[PDB]
Each structure stands twice: as structure tokens, then as C-alpha cells.
Amino acid sequence: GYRSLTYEEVLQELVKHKELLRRKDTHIRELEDYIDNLLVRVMEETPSILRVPYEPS
Amino acid sequence: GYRSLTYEEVLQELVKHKELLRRKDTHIRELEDYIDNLLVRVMEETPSILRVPYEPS
Amino acid sequence: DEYDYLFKVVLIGDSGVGKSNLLSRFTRNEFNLESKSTIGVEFATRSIQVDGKTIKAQIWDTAGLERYRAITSAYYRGAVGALLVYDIAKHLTYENVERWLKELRDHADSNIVIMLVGNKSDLRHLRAVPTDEARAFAEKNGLSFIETSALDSTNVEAAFQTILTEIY
Amino acid sequence: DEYDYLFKVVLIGDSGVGKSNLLSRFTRNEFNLESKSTIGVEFATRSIQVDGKTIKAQIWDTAGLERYRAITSAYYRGAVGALLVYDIAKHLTYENVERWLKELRDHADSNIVIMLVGNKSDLRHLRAVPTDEARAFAEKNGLSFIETSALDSTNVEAAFQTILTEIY
Numbered sequence: 001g002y003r004s005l006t007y008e009e010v011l012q013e014l015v016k017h018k019e020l021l022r023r024k025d026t027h028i029r030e031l032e033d034y035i036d037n038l039l040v041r042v043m044e045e046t047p048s049i050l051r052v053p054y055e056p057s
Numbered sequence: 058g059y060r061s062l063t064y065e066e067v068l069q070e071l072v073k074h075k076e077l078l079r080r081k082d083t084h085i086r087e088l089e090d091y092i093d094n095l096l097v098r099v100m101e102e103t104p105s106i107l108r109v110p111y112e113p114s
Numbered sequence: 115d116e117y118d119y120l121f122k123v124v125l126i127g128d129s130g131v132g133k134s135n136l137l138s139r140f141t142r143n144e145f146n147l148e149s150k151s152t153i154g155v156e157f158a159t160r161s162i163q164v165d166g167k168t169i170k171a172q173i174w175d176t177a178g179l180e181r182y183r184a185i186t187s188a189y190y191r192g193a194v195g196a197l198l199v200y201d202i203a204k205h206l207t208y209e210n211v212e213r214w215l216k217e218l219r220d221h222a223d224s225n226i227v228i229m230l231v232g233n234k235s236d237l238r239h240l241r242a243v244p245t246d247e248a249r250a251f252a253e254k255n256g257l258s259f260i261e262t263s264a265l266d267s268t269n270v271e272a273a274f275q276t277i278l279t280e281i282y
Numbered sequence: 283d284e285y286d287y288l289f290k291v292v293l294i295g296d297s298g299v300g301k302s303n304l305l306s307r308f309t310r311n312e313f314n315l316e317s318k319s320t321i322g323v324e325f326a327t328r329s330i331q332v333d334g335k336t337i338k339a340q341i342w343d344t345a346g347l348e349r350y351r352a353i354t355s356a357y358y359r360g361a362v363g364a365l366l367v368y369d370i371a372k373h374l375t376y377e378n379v380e381r382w383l384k385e386l387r388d389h390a391d392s393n394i395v396i397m398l399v400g401n402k403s404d405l406r407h408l409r410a411v412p413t414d415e416a417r418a419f420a421e422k423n424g425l426s427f428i429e430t431s432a433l434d435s436t437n438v439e440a441a442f443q444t445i446l447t448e449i450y
């Protein structure tokens with residue numbers, strides 16, 4: 001909770017941070033998709049790598 | 058760029074959004090680590106799944 | 115170390131209901147209060163005596179944030195049982211039960227043994243889902259039913275025991 | 283389809299320098315302007331004649347945002363060449379070159395053939411790194427040097443050709 005900036009400034013700051021969350025979300029989705037697409041392959045080929053605890057084969 | 062809220066409100070909004078970006082960052086890091094730790098195993102066991110284009114074995 | 119049957123079982127249910135702690139509690143006797151949303155897909159195995167037989171239970175877990183995704187087929191592939199879990203203290207997780215049911219009908223084998231599990235029974239003061247209401251729903255839908263607490267362990271063994279014996 | 287040698291080569295360099303497009307250009311003759319930061323680790327292979335010999339070049343790629351991570355050992359394991367890439371239009375990517383060099387010394391085989399590649403030579407109007415300055419640096423440090431453009435293709439073949447023949 002921290003003063004200094006004008007209402008105008010705090011307001012474009014809010015816009016800039018919204019756009020930044022949008023970019024982070026997109027990145028989270030990209031990461032998620034990559035994980036899922038890689039897991040399909042891991043699952044069909046060497047599912048044992050998904051074991052807990054991990055026994056190297 | 059959108060009015061309505063008091064300086065006080067736009068200001069706790071900014072704080073709330075900062076804390077939200079912090080949580081997204083953390084999540085991005087968790088996703089990244091999981092990827093890296095899974096890739097080590099994929100690499101040592103069945104690196105062919107990382108081929109482009111993907112030939113199922 | 116040998117065994118008479120290997121059974122693939124999957125955990126499904128809203129994020130936060132305690133799927134991963136039912137897993138760690140069953141397979142490792144461990145519980146974690148500071149338990150993060152499951153990333154990816156994993157499994158853990160445990161052997162138990164059910165009747166005369168030793169059964170390798172191969173228990174699969176993943177995030178229940180999403181319904182259908184690229185890992186979905188592979189996840190249900192070969193699964194002979196599902197534990198379908200809600201949180202007794204969150205009515206929403208219980209509303210979502212039929213949504214998860216459709217998801218089983220759509221992707222699991224038609225003969226999957228499904229058990230309905232109301233988890234977090236330690237939260238008796240915070241109960242949002244009366245046992246009877248869920249009990250009613252389960253029998254109506256051909257499902258075994260049980261309430262567990264991964265936190266204090268109540269019924270966790272019984273739950274896995276029951277589904278595994280009903281797979282036989 | 284058979285071959286006389288299989289050579290593992292890795293791409294390393296700051297994020298954004300064009301590593302993934304040197305890869306797609308070499309292996310598929312494809313270029314993408316809307317190219318996202320590489321997630322994970324991948325490779326693609328290409329066979330080429332170098333002297334009398336056919337060589338399977340197994341080209342590895344990953345994000346250059348991070349320096350050392352869990353995949354790092356496995357990434358350099360067995361690698362006989364590195365293309366160490368900067369962006370001729372971004373002086374910072376070129377400043378980072380010695381940082382990537384230390385990283386090779388630390389994790390790669392001591393006999394890795396390293397080539398220094400200034401990429402995006404199509405951006406002649408935007409040049410931030412004079413060829414001579416980079417040329418100087420490379421020979422001083424025992425490195426082959428070349429400038430490429432994954433976008434228009436200049437030197438991309440020559441770059442892979444050179445490193446592969448110097449691995450022989």
C-alpha cells in the first residue's frame with residue numbers, strides 16, 4: 001500500500017499489470033499443453049518413468 | 058483505461074494484482090521444474106520421444 | 115515381488131478434494147497438509163492381501179482441474195477401477211460428481227468398477243454433504259460409497275480394499 | 283537410413299537469438315517469424331554428405347533463458363559439437379557469449395568442437411556487433427566463426443557443414 005503516483009499513473013499501471021497477467025496465463029497454458037503432450041508419449045512408451053518412487057530402468 | 062473506482066480502490070486493486078502475478082510466477086516455476094525433472098528421465102531412458110518429428114517406437 | 119493380479123486404479127475428482135493424499139496415505143502412509151495441485155500424471159503401487167490373493171494395486175493420479183485432455187485416454191486405458199472423490203465439506207465438489215461420471219462413461223471401459231468417496235471426514239463441524247444424500251446418489255447410480263479422511267486415515271484402507279475386491 | 287557417423291550437436295545461446303530457427307531451417311528448410319520460446323528439450327536429425335561420408339547430425343535444442351538446470355548434463359552428454367549463437371543485432375546476446383563458454387567448459391566434454399554463430403545477418407541496418415570484433419574473439423578463443431540468417435538462409439548449411447567436418 002504505497003502512494004506517490006497520480007490517479008492517472010496508478011491507472012495505466014493497472015492496465016500494464018492486467019496485460020502482464022494475460023501473458024503469464026498464456027505461458028501457463030503453453031507449459032500445460034507441452035506437459036500433456038509429452039505425457040501421452042511417456043505413457044505409451046515408458047510409463048514406468050511416471051512411477052513414485054522412480055526406479056531407473 | 059477505465060474510471061469509476063476511487064484512488065483507494067484502484068490502489069488495493071494494484072496490490073491484489075501484484076500478489077496474483079507472484080502466484081502465477083511461482084506456478085510457472087513449478088511447471089518448469091516438473092518439465093526439467095521429467096526430461097532428465099525421458100532423456101536417460103527413451104530420448105527418442107524427444108525427436109521431431111515423433112516416431113512412435 | 116510377484117502377485118496374483120495387477121490392477122490399474124485411477125483417482126478422479128475436483129481439484130482440492132484430497133486425491134493425492136489418498137494416494138500417499140494408501141501407498142506410503144504419508145499425509146501432507148501443504149499439498150500442491152498435482153502437476154502431470156503419476157502412479158504409485160501397493161501390494162495387499164485381498165482374500166487369499168496378493169494384488170498389486172497400481173494407483174494413478176493427476177490434476178482434477180480439467181475434464182478432458184490429451185492424457186485422458188491413456189489415463190483410463192486399462193483402468194479396472196476408479197475412485198471418484200469429493201470433499202464432504204465442499205458442496206461444489208459433490209455437485210461435480212455427475213460431471214466426472216459422464217467423463218468415466220465417455221472414456222473408461224464400460225466395466226470399470228467405480229467407487230464414490232467423500233473425503234475429509236475429519237471436518238465433521240464443517241460438513242456440507244450429508245452422508246445420506248451421497249449414499250442415496252451412489253446406490254441409485256450403481257456405485258459403492260464410503261467416507262474417508264486422508265488426514266486421520268479413517269477408511270482409506272477400506273476404500274482401496276473394497277474397490278480392489280470388487281474388481282476380482 | 284544408415285550412415286557412417288552419428289554426431290550429437292547442441293544449440294546454446296541467449297533466448298531470442300534464433301537457435302530454434304537454425305534448427306528448423308537446417309533440418310526442415312522451414313522458418314517461423316512467430317517463433318515462441320522453446321519449451322523443454324528436443325532434437326531433429328539430418329543426414330548430409332561431408333567428404334565421402336554420410337553423417338546423421340542429431341541436433342539438440344532447448345531454451346537459452348537459463349544457464350544450469352537439471353537437464354544440463356544429459357543435454358551435453360555425448361555432444362561432439364556446440365553451435366553457440368548470438369544475435370548480430372543485440373549486443374547483449376554477444377556479451378553473454380563468454381558466459382555460455384564457461385558453461386561449455388563446465389559441462390561439455392573437453393573436446394567439444396565449438397562454433398560461434400552470429401545470427402540474423404539479414405538485419406544489416408540494425409547491426410550491433412561488428413563482424414571483426416566477433417571474428418577477433420573467436421580465433422582468440424579457438425572457435426570457428428560464421429554469420430548466418432535463419433530467415434533468408436545465408437550460411438546455415440555452411441555452419442552445420444563446417445562443425446560436422448571439424449568433428450570428423
Ligand SMILES: Nc1nc2c(ncn2[C@@H]2O[C@H](COP(=O)(O)OP(=O)(O)OP(=O)(O)O)[C@@H](O)[C@H]2O)c(=O)[nH]1
Nearest residue numbers: 129130131132133134135147152178234263264265
Ligand atoms: N482436513 C483434511 N484435509 C485434507 C484431506 N485430504 C487432503 N486434504 C487437504 O486438502 C488439500 C488438497 O489435497 P490434495 O491431496 O492435494 O487434493 P487434490 O485432489 O489431489 O488436488 P488436484 O491435484 O489439483 O486435483 C491439501 O491441503 C490437503 O492437505 C483430509 O482427509 N482432511
Ligand SMILES: Nc1nc2c(ncn2[C@@H]2O[C@H](COP(=O)(O)OP(=O)(O)OP(=O)(O)O)[C@@H](O)[C@H]2O)c(=O)[nH]1
Nearest residue numbers: 297298299300301302303315320346402431432433
Ligand atoms: N530477422 C531475423 N529473425 C530471426 C532469425 N532467426 C530467428 N529470428 C526471429 O527471432 C526470434 C527468435 O527466434 P528463435 O528461433 O525462437 O530463437 P531462440 O533462440 O530459439 O529462443 P529460446 O528458445 O527462448 O532460447 C523469432 O521471432 C524468429 O523469427 C534471423 O536469422 N533473422
Ligand SMILES: [Mg+2]
Nearest residue numbers: 133134151152
Ligand atoms: Mg493432487
Ligand SMILES: [Mg+2]
Nearest residue numbers: 177178180181
Ligand atoms: Mg482427468
Ligand SMILES: [Mg+2]
Nearest residue numbers: 301302319320
Ligand atoms: Mg527456441
Ligand SMILES: [Mg+2]
Nearest residue numbers: 345346348349
Ligand atoms: Mg542450457
